[PDB]
């Protein structure tokens, strides 16, 4: 109920949104039906256009007026933003030669710069080139401030999941917005775009910004609008809370603009159409920096210019239909789109089985324009799993594609010429970030980066302290002139032990045969110190990587290779390895090929064993150390070793060796020297974090050789390729993945091909940032490096796309 004959006089756009029956007059009230009668003829007052014209100046204040021309409207603070132009032989923002801005120059009072953040949907990164004839002062911000290509937003590319991970620096799985349509199974409840269950605060996970700072003494404009209140009225709204007095005026605030999403959706990205929403967007945005410069504002004042995610061509000939695939279709429910997420439609139904439905949706047709997946099998930098509102199966749909159900709901619901959801390493997706005020630097271009990170460098701009999230907090200092947050790197938790040899060959009793019985002093000697690691200087460029948990392990020093071996998990949980771009590759001689050999310095009870691998009919096992890379015949042996073991499914072998075999070596062509660390990963929750003893859900047959759900590869070498990687005076270059570790290659379409018709692509597709193999393995590379912690952290988050320019 709302008993809507209270008043709105004196409460337009109240910051305290009051509680029912009250009636209301915030910037939400109309989206909950709730406002005073009184609402649109003392808030959205439209008399007399938006504009100053030469015979208003200096009228009269006439209350009815949208926007004041009148003399005292400044200190009142509701000029018409070209007030000064008009009436007082100013000009334009835009039209001024920009300035460095090297200090806040704000009216006193003023305790910290504000930041405005100016949101715009479906603003896909390429508009900043393709339409800066028509976007001046956008144009004027990007040039003048500290601007990034594009930005990468979070997947599912969609608006809600979006909009709400910049407001908390959290992936889609923690901050329980997975959608524009979600079902809760906990709640028995569904939400959607349309109605009234987005409203209820049990789907809002995480601490967003506007309570961050509510939390710490800092005000904050409210950033929600209805999507009536037209734009000129939200401007002059923010305007309207900055001319406050010094006790009540916010310090952060949000504009949101619903285009270009609206109108690409009719168009497509690049429909000639999309130039006047264009048009339109940049002229909300000269307002807005007219507003502030007549408020002596415009030096003070940091803003931001960010999109939610971009728009690709997609119409409705290009979909495609579960009816072509399963018998069955009425029994499951589909999210579908630009992404596909399928449950049981009745949980009562027994027979619903996920694998059989996988099964017929797998690499059926030649071209097929989606891939299904168990969710825990999705591409890990995708971060979507971890949430009970996430159905088992997904579908990741292609680029320009759609999945139905049936033929029925894409002519029973062509209209769209453009969609948004898929990958978010898809170029089309990438969207915009422009910084520009006192914070931010003066005409510096930054890398790309990723939406999680900003979440913290907006608590930079404001002096809080951010809740916990998925930014790596002091990666994107780089943007800011000032306040930048200097992180410690975290301490070691557990430190490691260097064993000697103490065990001699007949205590082990391994079934592990190896024909090594093959026999000098300058060589004794030589091979002692590559033992006591005389080339770990070579092998290990950047520190050894620190285990952060509390856990039992060894160094171990190799001509070729150094390795931190785990008694707990009887696996190197790292192996670091450096490969010049001179390097041979060979053969594995035949006197080796299911050779095993036990290592003197590790016990046999905290040693693997070949009979284990023997008896599992499903499990093989690889090197993390290939040996065809050795430096030497007599080094070869030392890749042999019963702790340079891992057990490998026979299907992901072939991936393996592939990647052993060729790409390092190519990699180290192409790249000047690589640097390689390599492990494995167990994540049987799908949480992207490191699994204890106790959460692993399978062993090789009979034994305590826990198995991987991933493999791990970090490739690292010099910016500058002229220098070598072990020999680098500058910034460094890095691409990691994180292979799953699969018992087919299902995944995999063109799978029975030679493995240089698919491999490469497979491992495209699990590319990763080096902090998402932190986060899973509870370790920390790039310990001991002369660059600066800051520089190591951008170089961590790092990801490489694979995607053209
Ligand atoms: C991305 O960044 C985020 C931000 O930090 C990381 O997520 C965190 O991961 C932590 C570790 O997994 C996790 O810490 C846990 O907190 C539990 C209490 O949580 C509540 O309070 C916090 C703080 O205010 C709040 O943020 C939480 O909000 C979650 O849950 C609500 C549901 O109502 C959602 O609205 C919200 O979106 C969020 O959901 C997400 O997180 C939860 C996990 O907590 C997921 O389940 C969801 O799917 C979703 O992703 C909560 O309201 C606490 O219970 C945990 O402690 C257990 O384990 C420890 C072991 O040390 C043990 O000591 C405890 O006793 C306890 O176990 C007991 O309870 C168990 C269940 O009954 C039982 O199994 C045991 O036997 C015991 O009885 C734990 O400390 C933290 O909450 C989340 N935070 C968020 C916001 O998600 C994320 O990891 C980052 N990702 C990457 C890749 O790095
Ligand atoms: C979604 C979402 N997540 N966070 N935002 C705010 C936002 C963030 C950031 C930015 F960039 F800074 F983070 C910048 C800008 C915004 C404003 C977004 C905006 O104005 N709209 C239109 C109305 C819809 S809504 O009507 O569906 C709606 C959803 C939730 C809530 S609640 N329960 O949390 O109060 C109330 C509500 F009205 C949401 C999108 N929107
Ligand atoms: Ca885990
Ligand atoms: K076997
Ligand atoms: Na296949
Ligand atoms: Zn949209």
């Given at each position: 109920?709302t008993?809507?004959?209270?008043?709105?006089?004196?409460?337009?756009?109240e910051?305290?949104?009051?509680?029912?029956?009250?009636?209301?007059?915030?910037?939400?009230?109309?989206?909950?039906?709730?406002?005073?009668?009184?609402?649109?003829?003392?808030?959205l007052?439209?008399?007399?256009?938006?504009?100053?014209?030469?015979?208003?100046?200096?009228?009269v204040?006439?209350?009815?007026?949208?926007?004041?021309?009148s003399?005292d409207?400044?200190?009142?603070?509701?000029?018409?933003?070209?007030?000064?132009?008009v009436?007082?032989?100013?000009?334009?923002?835009?039209?001024?030669?920009?300035?460095?801005?090297?200090?806040?120059?704000?009216?006193?009072?003023?305790?910290?710069?504000?930041?405005?953040?100016?949101?715009?949907?479906g603003?896909?990164?390429?508009?900043?080139?393709?339409?800066?004839?028509?976007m001046?002062?956008?144009?004027?911000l990007?040039?003048?401030?500290?601007?990034?290509?594009?930005?990468?937003?979070?997947?599912?590319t969609?608006?809600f999941?979006?909009?709400?991970?910049?407001?908390?620096?959290?992936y889609?799985?923690?901050?329980?917005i997975?959608?524009?349509?979600?079902?809760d199974?906990v709640?028995?409840?569904?939400?959607?775009?349309?109605?009234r269950?987005?409203?209820?605060?049990?789907?809002?996970?995480?601490?967003?910004?506007?309570?961050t700072?509510?939390?710490?003494?800092?005000?904050?404009?409210?950033?929600?609008?209805?999507?009536?209140?037209?734009?000129?009225?939200?401007?002059?709204?923010?305007?309207?809370?900055?001319?406050?007095?010094?006790?009540?005026?916010p310090?952060?605030?949000?504009?949101?603009?619903?285009?270009?999403?609206?109108?690409?959706?009719?168009?497509?990205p690049?429909?000639?159409?999309m130039?006047?929403?264009?048009?339109?967007?940049?002229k909300?945005?000269?307002?807005?920096?007219?507003?502030?410069?007549?408020?002596?504002?415009?030096?003070?004042?940091?803003?931001?210019?960010?999109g939610?995610?971009?728009?690709?061509?997609?119409?409705?000939?290009?979909?495609?239909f579960?009816?072509?695939?399963?018998?069955?279709?009425?029994?499951?429910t589909?999210?579908?789109?630009?992404?596909?997420?399928?449950?049981?439609?009745?949980?009562?139904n027994?027979?619903?089985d996920?694998?059989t439905?996988?099964?017929?949706?797998?690499?059926?047709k030649?071209?097929?324009?989606?891939?299904?997946?168990?969710?825990?099998?999705?591409?890990?930098?995708l971060?979507?799993?971890?949430?009970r509102?996430?159905?088992?199966?997904?579908?990741?749909?292609?680029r320009?594609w759609?999945?139905?159900?049936?033929?029925?709901?894409v002519?029973?619901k062509?209209?769209?010429?453009g969609?948004?959801?898929?990958?978010?390493?898809?170029?089309?997706?990438q969207?915009?970030?422009?910084?520009?005020?006192?914070?931010?630097?003066?005409?510096?271009?930054?890398?790309?980066?990723?939406?999680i990170?900003?979440?913290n460098?907006?608590?930079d701009?404001?002096?809080?302290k951010?809740?916990?999230?998925?930014?790596?907090?002091?990666?994107?200092?780089?943007?800011?002139?000032?306040?930048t947050?200097?992180?410690?790197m975290?301490?070691?938790?557990?430190?490691?032990?260097?064993?000697?040899?103490m065990?001699?060959?007949?205590?082990?009793?391994?079934?592990?045969?190896?024909?090594?019985?093959?026999?000098?002093?300058?060589?004794?000697?030589?091979?002692?110190?590559h033992?006591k690691?005389?080339?770990?200087?070579?092998?290990?460029?950047?520190?050894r990587?620190?285990?952060?948990?509390?856990?039992?392990?060894?160094?171990?020093?190799?001509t070729?290779?150094?390795?931190?071996?785990s008694?707990?998990?009887?696996?190197?949980?790292?192996?670091?390895?450096?490969?010049?771009?001179?390097?041979?590759?060979?053969?594995?001689?035949?006197?080796?090929?299911?050779?095993?050999?036990?290592?003197?310095?590790?016990?046999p009870?905290f040693?693997?064993?070949?009979?284990?691998?023997?008896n599992?009919?499903q499990?093989?096992?690889g090197?993390?150390?290939?040996?065809?890379?050795?430096?030497?015949?007599?080094?070869?042996?030392?890749?042999?070793?019963?702790?340079?073991?891992?057990?490998?499914?026979?299907?992901?072998?072939?991936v393996?060796?592939?990647?052993?075999?060729?790409?390092?070596?190519?990699?180290?062509?192409?790249?000047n020297?690589?640097?390689?660390?390599?492990?494995?990963?167990?994540?049987?929750?799908?949480?992207?974090?490191?699994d204890?003893?106790?959460?692993?859900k399978?062993?090789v047959?009979?034994?305590?050789?826990?198995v991987?759900?991933?493999?791990?590869?970090?490739?690292?070498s010099?910016?500058?390729?002229?220098?070598?990687?072990?020999?680098?005076?500058?910034?460094?270059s890095?691409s990691?993945?994180?292979?799953?570790?699969?018992?087919?290659?299902?995944?995999?379409?063109?799978?029975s091909?030679?493995?240089?018709?698919?491999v490469?692509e497979l491992?495209?597709?699990?590319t990763?940032?080096?902090?998402?193999?932190?986060?899973?393995?509870?370790?920390?590379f790039?310990?001991?490096?002369?660059?600066?912690?800051?520089?190591?952290?951008?170089?961590?988050?790092?990801?490489?796309?694979?995607?053209?320019?």
């Amino acid at each position: 109920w709302t008993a809507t004959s209270g008043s709105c006089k004196g409460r337009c756009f109240e910051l305290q949104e009051v509680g029912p029956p009250d009636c209301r007059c915030d910037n939400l009230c109309k989206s909950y039906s709730s406002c005073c009668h009184d609402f649109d003829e003392l808030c959205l007052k439209t008399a007399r256009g938006w504009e100053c014209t030469k015979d208003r100046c200096g009228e009269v204040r006439n209350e009815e007026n949208a926007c004041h021309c009148s003399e005292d409207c400044l200190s009142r603070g509701d000029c018409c933003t070209n007030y000064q132009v008009v009436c007082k032989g100013e000009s334009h923002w835009v039209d001024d030669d920009c300035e460095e801005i090297k200090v806040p120059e704000c009216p006193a009072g003023f305790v910290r710069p504000p930041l405005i953040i100016f949101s715009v949907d479906g603003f896909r990164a390429s508009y900043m080139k393709k339409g800066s004839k028509v976007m001046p002062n956008i144009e004027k911000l990007r040039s003048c401030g500290t601007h990034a290509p594009y930005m990468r937003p979070v997947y599912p590319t969609k608006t809600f999941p979006n909009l709400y991970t910049l407001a908390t620096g959290l992936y889609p799985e923690s901050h329980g917005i997975v959608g524009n349509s979600m079902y809760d199974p906990v709640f028995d409840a569904s939400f959607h775009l349309r109605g009234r269950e987005k409203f209820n605060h049990r789907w809002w996970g995480g601490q967003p910004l506007w309570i961050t700072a509510t939390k710490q003494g800092v005000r904050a404009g409210t950033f929600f609008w209805s999507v009536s209140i037209p734009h000129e009225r939200r401007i002059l709204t923010i305007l309207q809370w900055l001319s406050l007095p010094d006790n009540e005026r916010p310090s952060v605030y949000a504009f949101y603009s619903e285009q270009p999403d609206f109108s690409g959706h009719k168009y497509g990205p690049f429909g000639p159409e999309m130039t006047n929403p264009l048009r339109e967007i940049d002229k909300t945005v000269g307002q807005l920096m007219d507003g502030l410069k007549q408020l002596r504002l415009h030096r003070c004042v940091n803003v931001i210019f960010v999109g939610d995610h971009g728009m690709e061509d997609v119409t409705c000939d290009r979909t495609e239909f579960l009816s072509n695939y399963l018998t069955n279709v009425d029994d499951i429910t589909l999210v579908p789109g630009t992404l596909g997420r399928i449950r049981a439609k009745s949980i009562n139904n027994s027979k619903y089985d996920p694998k059989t439905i996988i099964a017929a949706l797998t690499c059926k047709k030649p071209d097929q324009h989606f891939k299904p997946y168990m969710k825990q099998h999705l591409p890990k930098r995708l971060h979507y799993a971890n949430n009970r509102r996430i159905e088992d199966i997904h579908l990741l749909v292609d680029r320009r594609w759609h999945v139905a159900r049936k033929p029925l709901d894409v002519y029973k619901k062509c209209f769209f010429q453009g969609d948004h959801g898929f990958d978010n390493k898809v170029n089309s997706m990438q969207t915009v970030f422009v910084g520009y005020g006192p914070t931010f630097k003066y005409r510096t271009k930054v890398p790309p980066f990723e939406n999680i990170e900003l979440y913290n460098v907006m608590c930079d701009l404001l002096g809080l302290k951010p809740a916990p999230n998925n930014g790596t907090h002091g990666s994107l200092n780089h943007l800011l002139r000032t306040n930048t947050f200097r992180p410690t790197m975290p301490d070691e938790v557990s430190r490691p032990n260097y064993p000697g040899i103490m065990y001699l060959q007949s205590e082990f009793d391994l079934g592990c045969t190896c024909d090594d019985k093959v026999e000098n002093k300058l060589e004794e000697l030589n091979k002692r110190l590559h033992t006591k690691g005389s080339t770990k200087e070579r092998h290990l460029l950047y520190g050894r990587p620190a285990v952060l948990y509390r856990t039992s392990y060894d160094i171990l020093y190799h001509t070729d290779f150094e390795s931190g071996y785990s008694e707990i998990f009887l696996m190197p949980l790292w192996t670091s390895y450096t490969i010049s771009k001179q390097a041979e590759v060979s053969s594995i001689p035949e006197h080796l090929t299911n050779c095993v050999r036990p290592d003197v310095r590790v016990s046999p009870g905290f040693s693997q064993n070949c009979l284990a691998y023997k008896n599992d009919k499903q499990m093989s096992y690889g090197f993390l150390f290939p040996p065809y890379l050795s430096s030497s015949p007599e080094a070869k042996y030392d890749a042999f070793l019963v702790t340079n073991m891992v057990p490998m499914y026979p299907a992901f072998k072939r991936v393996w060796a592939y990647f052993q075999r060729v790409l390092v070596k190519k990699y180290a062509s192409e790249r000047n020297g690589v640097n390689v660390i390599s492990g494995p990963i167990f994540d049987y929750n799908y949480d992207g974090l490191r699994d204890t003893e106790d959460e692993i859900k399978q062993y090789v047959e009979g034994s305590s050789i826990p198995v991987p759900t991933h493999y791990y590869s970090i490739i690292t070498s010099c910016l500058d390729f002229t220098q070598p990687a072990d020999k680098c005076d500058g910034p460094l270059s890095v691409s990691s993945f994180i292979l799953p570790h699969r018992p087919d290659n299902d995944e995999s379409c063109n799978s029975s091909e030679d493995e240089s018709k698919w491999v490469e692509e497979l491992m495209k597709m699990h590319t990763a940032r080096v902090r998402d193999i932190e986060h899973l393995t509870g370790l920390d590379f790039y310990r001991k490096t002369s660059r600066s912690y800051s520089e190591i952290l951008t170089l961590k988050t790092y990801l490489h796309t694979y995607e053209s320019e």
